[PDB]
Amino acid sequence: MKRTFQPSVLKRNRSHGFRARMATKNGRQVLARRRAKGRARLTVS
Amino acid sequence: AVVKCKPTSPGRRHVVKVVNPELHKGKPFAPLLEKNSKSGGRNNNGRITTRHIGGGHKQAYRIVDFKRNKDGIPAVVERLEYDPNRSANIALVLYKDGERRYILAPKGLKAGDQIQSGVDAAIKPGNTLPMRNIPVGSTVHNVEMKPGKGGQLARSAGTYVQIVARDGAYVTLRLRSGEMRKVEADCRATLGEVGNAEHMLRVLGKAGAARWRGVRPTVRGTAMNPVDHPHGGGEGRNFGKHPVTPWGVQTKGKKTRSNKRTDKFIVRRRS
Amino acid sequence: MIREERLLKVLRAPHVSEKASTAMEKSNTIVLKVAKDATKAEIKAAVQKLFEVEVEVVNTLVVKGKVKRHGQRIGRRSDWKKAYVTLKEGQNL
RNA sequence: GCUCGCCGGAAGACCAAGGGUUCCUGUCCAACGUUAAUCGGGGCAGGGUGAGUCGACCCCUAAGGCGAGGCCGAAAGGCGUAGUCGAUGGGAAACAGGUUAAUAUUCCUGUACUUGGUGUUACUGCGAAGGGGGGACGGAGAAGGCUAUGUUGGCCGGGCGACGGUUGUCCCGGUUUAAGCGUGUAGGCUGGUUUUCCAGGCAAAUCCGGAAAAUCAAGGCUGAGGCGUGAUGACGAGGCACUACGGUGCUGAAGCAACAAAUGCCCUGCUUCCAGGAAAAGCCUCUAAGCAUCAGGUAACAUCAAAUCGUACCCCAAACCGACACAGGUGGUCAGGUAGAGAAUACCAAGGCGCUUGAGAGAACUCGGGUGAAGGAACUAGGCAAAAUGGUGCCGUAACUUCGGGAGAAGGCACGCUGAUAUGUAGGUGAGGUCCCUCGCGGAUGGAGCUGAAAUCAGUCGAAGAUACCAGCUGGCUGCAACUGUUUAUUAAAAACACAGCACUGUGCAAACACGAAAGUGGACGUAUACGGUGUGACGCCUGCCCGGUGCCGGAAGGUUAAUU
RNA sequence: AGGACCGAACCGACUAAUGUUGAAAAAUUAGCGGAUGACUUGUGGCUGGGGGUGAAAGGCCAAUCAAACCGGGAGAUAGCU
Ligand SMILES: [K+]
Ligand SMILES: [K+]
Ligand SMILES: [K+]
Ligand SMILES: [K+]
Ligand SMILES: [K+]
Ligand SMILES: [K+]
Ligand SMILES: [K+]
Ligand SMILES: [K+]
Ligand SMILES: [K+]
Ligand SMILES: [K+]
Ligand SMILES: [K+]
Ligand SMILES: [K+]
Ligand SMILES: [K+]
Ligand SMILES: [K+]
Ligand SMILES: [K+]
Ligand SMILES: [K+]
Ligand SMILES: [K+]
Ligand SMILES: [Mg+2]
Ligand SMILES: [Mg+2]
Ligand SMILES: [Mg+2]
Ligand SMILES: [Mg+2]
Ligand SMILES: [Mg+2]
Ligand SMILES: [Mg+2]
Ligand SMILES: [Mg+2]
Ligand SMILES: [Mg+2]
Ligand SMILES: [Mg+2]
Ligand SMILES: [Mg+2]
Ligand SMILES: [Mg+2]
Ligand SMILES: [Mg+2]
Ligand SMILES: [Mg+2]
Ligand SMILES: [Mg+2]
Ligand SMILES: [Mg+2]
Ligand SMILES: [Mg+2]
Ligand SMILES: [Mg+2]
Ligand SMILES: [Mg+2]
Ligand SMILES: [Mg+2]
Ligand SMILES: [Mg+2]
Ligand SMILES: [Mg+2]
Ligand SMILES: [Mg+2]
Ligand SMILES: [Mg+2]
Ligand SMILES: [Mg+2]
Ligand SMILES: [Mg+2]
Ligand SMILES: [Mg+2]
Ligand SMILES: [Mg+2]
Ligand SMILES: [Mg+2]
Ligand SMILES: [Mg+2]
Ligand SMILES: [Mg+2]
Ligand SMILES: [Mg+2]
Ligand SMILES: [Mg+2]
Ligand SMILES: [Mg+2]
Ligand SMILES: [Mg+2]
Ligand SMILES: [Mg+2]
Ligand SMILES: [Mg+2]
Ligand SMILES: [Mg+2]
Ligand SMILES: [Mg+2]
Ligand SMILES: [Mg+2]
Ligand SMILES: [Mg+2]
Ligand SMILES: [Mg+2]
Ligand SMILES: [Mg+2]
Ligand SMILES: [Mg+2]
Ligand SMILES: [Mg+2]
Ligand SMILES: [Mg+2]
Ligand SMILES: [Mg+2]
Ligand SMILES: [Mg+2]
Ligand SMILES: [Mg+2]
Ligand SMILES: [Mg+2]
Ligand SMILES: [Mg+2]
Ligand SMILES: [Mg+2]
Ligand SMILES: [Mg+2]
Ligand SMILES: [Mg+2]
Ligand SMILES: [Mg+2]
Ligand SMILES: [Mg+2]
Ligand SMILES: [Mg+2]
Ligand SMILES: [Mg+2]
Ligand SMILES: [Mg+2]
Ligand SMILES: [Mg+2]
Ligand SMILES: [Mg+2]
Ligand SMILES: [Mg+2]
Ligand SMILES: [Mg+2]
Ligand SMILES: [Mg+2]
């Protein structure tokens, strides 16, 4: 059966990538939270 | 001509077609075409703002001359064409100077007929004049509401306006709605009625024919749940409320015009 | 024209393998490890200057580094650039 | 290694997406592998991805995104102009053969092609952010011409048979060759050329559009395939010689014709229909400012350049999505033989596999199947399930009907093989030969050869000839819904939803209405034969009485009545 | 010609049996419906939570839906166990 995750790198990057995060205040707050938590991987990029 | 399809299948039994042999079978005039991609009735917020719009055939936009302001230069009708963007047919016209334009095709207009616009044009179908220069009692179409703005009234297939009176700077028009409206006498109009009056005799015949025209299904309020529509709900077919729109406004008689700016121009409402 | 400083950094090592040995004997082609950012033009110039031979053509590829377990921890070797440098017929490097 | 079995419009082959070394070689067997494992997609190490032409990048745009100024908004922000991004679409160019353990249109061999830079010669109005052309477009259908491809013959090489026969009307195999360059054919489209003039193409124009004469009748554009060359080459059945028996080396005959033939190509065509079928650049052409014997343009010639990134491997799957080496899911391309209408189905080819526990036994019971005396729905909530019907041709076919239907109604007959008609017919294809020729890839003619149904008559085997696989059960009465559609992903597919049709009602355009503190946007580049809302639901015959209640519409005298004063 | 007919691919999901610590958190097998259209499918895009989208089932919005998910108010409150 067709499951929910149907990977596409283009859609992944456009939806959740670094530049998508940087494009809005709320996306930049995601990056701020993840840097503050000390995440090794900030985004899907 | 109005042609009834033979009932060779249940989707054909009720079809009534308007078949016009005068219309150009070839492609339209490419310099007067533009793309017009579809909306699905969605605005720039991406939200449906008009329900029941979607799909249907791809259509190119024909640039139609509603202004008719190329005055004093005769034009000859080259051919009548199907226009998917409107109920009326259009006419490709060639001016003496070599310019081509599209116009709304009036009743009776055929290839080879001569037309002209301006103050000194003849009172003949397809000629455009200021309504100051058109006799009272005349049948006109493509009527401007402001001078130079381009025709906005009586553009649909078979429609027309009657100039009932002339009073100083204004003319009184009887519109197809039955409304009596004042318009400035400097506003242009084209003599005659819009052609293709048989348009209203078509019978689509099947669901799919509406879908081809980009009309999506209407779901009745009473078929829904209360959460979706005021009419929703009931164990079985129930109603028991005054009919309303999906947004709760009475939909059987309640007047919705509210334009104090334009009230002065309305002599008599359609009633 | 490329500066000599640049040319002295583009060639990293000869690449030793069965395919490299066969390339030399059959097609007069030397196989080199080169700087990751080296272009075909830079490799050609560097080989002609430093090895004193005449180069016909340079073909290049990027070798992607292997992922490798050292104990438990996962690591990755570096990507590197390989150059197949075809010499003219009678050069004999 | 031999045999057996299974797939073969796939369980083969090549990819995109996704994955990321799983690829190849050596080595190891703890763990992983539902068992053992010497094996592995497992561990460890080493190797492996070669491009002017394939793809990305790049030029160009779609939906849409972002958006200098701008407009709007307590702030955050929203919208949007100029622009700038954005492929799933448009835009230059390479083929065949050979080669690695593992890449190859990338390496090698042979033979090509494209774009741009610089110079040399010649001739020469070049010049855009502008104009015009072009690019540039739908559905269905029909037929002709072809090719891929197949079959048969010829040719060449080999064979003479484990058991009766097999020197032939015998058996097996091969019979392949590209892009490019040249030629211009079946077919498709269109009348040419010249002169003069002009309110149009934001200005100009020699271009496009328009007008008027002159003149001639064949001019131009497009185009599959074929043919020639590419090719005195490459490939080649096999033979010979080695092997480190995995694989190499050596050498190599014929390499033709006829017939059949696509869903591929001519064809972005043609015919036809209504629901009326992207954009922008490259490209061609026109000039403006400008430069003006300079730059620039044009062609040939020479020379230089074409970077960078991807390229292994899986890819209907043990490598992707499903926690698994999971009976699931996953877009594109290729399309052999016999039978067949067929991409169904059966059996096969190329190729790929036997599904990572086996060995016995032959109880009940369960699962999946086969057959069944007599009976034949007695079963059961219900013929649930099963059994049955099933093909082609011809004959024949009721009520009712909206005249289409109902209908494949129902029901019935024929069907294999052999011979003859006819040593293979009707039809299709079409060589040599002959004839003509505004001269070719040409007609007129001719039927050699090839292919080839269908029918009739006669005979003949079986219980049975649509023999397997495959493949409608049929009829009668009635409720509901007109119909095709749609729906509760995962217990409901229906009488529910939708529907064409009908009606009421709103809406005069800065429309009503909707999204939005707003700007705006949709409605619509629509305009009352239009658009929104509501109910009803094809069609036929129709749709009665009630305005007291609640709503809506109109009224506006009188009563009552807010802020305010 | 056709929301025409029979029927593969393709799209569905009417019946039955199996399976129900499954081979599978919805399938398999035999049958079944549509199959030029109101068809189906690839890639990309847009609509956002009292919000969307809905040929309308309160259906669907990442195995979640009469108000998604994540974090926070937060140790909500719990005359109840
Ligand atoms: K409805
Ligand atoms: K109701
Ligand atoms: K909802
Ligand atoms: K109800
Ligand atoms: K109900
Ligand atoms: K074992
Ligand atoms: K390249
Ligand atoms: K690049
Ligand atoms: K024998
Ligand atoms: K080529
Ligand atoms: K050729
Ligand atoms: K490769
Ligand atoms: K792939
Ligand atoms: K019935
Ligand atoms: K159903
Ligand atoms: K009343
Ligand atoms: K909510
Ligand atoms: Mg509507
Ligand atoms: Mg129309
Ligand atoms: Mg329209
Ligand atoms: Mg309706
Ligand atoms: Mg309901
Ligand atoms: Mg309510
Ligand atoms: Mg009731
Ligand atoms: Mg009641
Ligand atoms: Mg090379
Ligand atoms: Mg490369
Ligand atoms: Mg590994
Ligand atoms: Mg391996
Ligand atoms: Mg084990
Ligand atoms: Mg052991
Ligand atoms: Mg391994
Ligand atoms: Mg290319
Ligand atoms: Mg845009
Ligand atoms: Mg914006
Ligand atoms: Mg700004
Ligand atoms: Mg761009
Ligand atoms: Mg693309
Ligand atoms: Mg390989
Ligand atoms: Mg078409
Ligand atoms: Mg052929
Ligand atoms: Mg012989
Ligand atoms: Mg014998
Ligand atoms: Mg033979
Ligand atoms: Mg087809
Ligand atoms: Mg590969
Ligand atoms: Mg297994
Ligand atoms: Mg699997
Ligand atoms: Mg599929
Ligand atoms: Mg076959
Ligand atoms: Mg099959
Ligand atoms: Mg048994
Ligand atoms: Mg049993
Ligand atoms: Mg049985
Ligand atoms: Mg019995
Ligand atoms: Mg018996
Ligand atoms: Mg019996
Ligand atoms: Mg009986
Ligand atoms: Mg009975
Ligand atoms: Mg009984
Ligand atoms: Mg009983
Ligand atoms: Mg049954
Ligand atoms: Mg059965
Ligand atoms: Mg009853
Ligand atoms: Mg129905
Ligand atoms: Mg149905
Ligand atoms: Mg369900
Ligand atoms: Mg169901
Ligand atoms: Mg507006
Ligand atoms: Mg109803
Ligand atoms: Mg049908
Ligand atoms: Mg469904
Ligand atoms: Mg099934
Ligand atoms: Mg049917
Ligand atoms: Mg069917
Ligand atoms: Mg309910
Ligand atoms: Mg869900
Ligand atoms: Mg709530
Ligand atoms: Mg609190
Ligand atoms: Mg608590």
Curated annotation (Swiss-Prot), chain A:
It comes from the Bacteria. Signal peptide: none annotated. GO terms for molecular function: structural constituent of ribosome. Keywords: Ribonucleoprotein, Ribosomal protein. GO terms for cellular component: cytoplasm; cytosolic large ribosomal subunit. InterPro entries: Ribosomal_bL34, Ribosomal_bL34_CS. It holds the Pfam family Ribosomal_L34. One of its GO terms (biological process) is cytoplasmic translation. Belongs to the bacterial ribosomal protein bL34 family. HAMAP family: Ribosomal_bL34. Part of the 50S ribosomal subunit. This is Large ribosomal subunit protein bL34. The lineage of its organism: Bacteria, Pseudomonadati, Pseudomonadota, Gammaproteobacteria, Enterobacterales.
UniProtKB/Swiss-Prot annotation, chain B:
Keywords: Acetylation, Ribonucleoprotein, Ribosomal protein, RNA-binding, rRNA-binding. One of its GO terms (molecular function) is structural constituent of ribosome. Pfam families: Ribosomal_L2, Ribosomal_L2_C. The keyword Ribosomal protein applies. The modification N6-acetyllysine is found at residue 241. Transmembrane segments: none annotated. Residues 38-47 have a biased composition (Low complexity). Residues 27-52, 220-271 are annotated as: Disordered. PROSITE patterns: RIBOSOMAL_L2. GO terms for biological process: cytoplasmic translation; negative regulation of DNA-templated DNA replication initiation; ribosomal large subunit assembly. GO terms for cellular component: cytoplasm; cytosol; cytosolic large ribosomal subunit; DnaA-L2 complex. Changing residue 229 to Q: Loss of peptidyltransferase activity in reconstituted ribosomes. No change in rRNA binding or assembly into ribosomes. The keyword rRNA-binding applies. Signal peptide: none annotated. Belongs to the universal ribosomal protein uL2 family. One of the primary rRNA binding proteins. Located near the base of the L1 stalk, it is probably also mobile. Required for association of the 30S and 50S subunits to form the 70S ribosome, for tRNA binding and peptide bond formation. It has been suggested to have peptidyltransferase activity; this is highly controversial. In the E.coli 70S ribosome in the initiation state it has been modeled to make several contacts with the 16S rRNA (forming bridge B7b, PubMed:12809609); these contacts are broken in the model with bound EF-G. This protein can be partially replaced in vivo by its H.marismortui (HmaL2) or human (L8, from the 60S cytoplasmic ribosome) homolog. Part of the 50S ribosomal subunit. Forms a bridge to the 30S subunit in the 70S ribosome, contacting the 16S rRNA. Interacts weakly with S6 in one of the 3.5 A resolved structures. In pull-down experiments interacts with CedA. This is Large ribosomal subunit protein uL2. It comes from Escherichia coli (strain K12). The lineage of its organism: Bacteria, Pseudomonadati, Pseudomonadota, Gammaproteobacteria, Enterobacterales.
UniProtKB/Swiss-Prot annotation, chain C:
One of the early assembly proteins, it binds 23S rRNA; is essential for growth. One of the proteins that surround the polypeptide exit tunnel on the outside of the subunit. Acts as the docking site for trigger factor for Ffh binding to the ribosome (SRP54) and to nascent polypeptide chains. GO terms for biological process: cytoplasmic translation; ribosomal large subunit assembly. This is Large ribosomal subunit protein uL23. Keywords: Ribonucleoprotein, Ribosomal protein, RNA-binding, rRNA-binding. The keyword Ribosomal protein applies. InterPro entries: Nucleotide-bd_a/b_plait_sf, Ribosomal_uL23-like, Ribosomal_uL23/eL15/eS24_sf, Ribosomal_uL23_CS. One of its GO terms (cellular component) is cytoplasm. Signal peptide: none annotated. It comes from the Bacteria. The gene is rplW. Changing residue 18 to A: Binds normally to ribosomes; strongly reduces trigger factor binding. Part of the 50S ribosomal subunit. Contacts protein L29 and trigger factor. Might also contact SecE and probably does contact SecG and SecY when the SecYEG translocation complex is docked with the ribosome. Belongs to the universal ribosomal protein uL23 family. One of its GO terms (molecular function) is rRNA binding.
